[PDB]
């Protein structure tokens, strides 16, 4: 890699975030403000997305 190369020959850093978006238990999680739990009422819910 030479700094005077044309853009297509210049170095690019690449990162590839690969998700195991499966039925398994979660450990990497979005910054959501969790609530107290509610039961026996009809409710909206979001468990681990």
């Amino acid at each position: 890699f030479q700094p005077t190369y044309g853009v297509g020959y210049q170095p690019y850093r690449v990162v590839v975030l690969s998700f195991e978006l499966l039925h398994a238990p979660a450990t990497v999680c979005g910054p959501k403000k969790s609530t107290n739990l509610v039961k026996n009422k009809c409710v909206n819910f979001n468990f681990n997305g």
Binding site: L22, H23, A24, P25
Partner: peptide
């Protein structure tokens, strides 16, 4: 040497609970 495996080597195919069902 060899022997018969019978029914052995079944495993839970995914981490989902299921009950009273014949899943395929």
């Amino acid at each position: 040497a060899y022997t018969n495996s019978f029914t052995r080597g079944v495993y839970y195919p995914d981490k989902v609970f299921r009950s009273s069902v014949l899943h395929s």
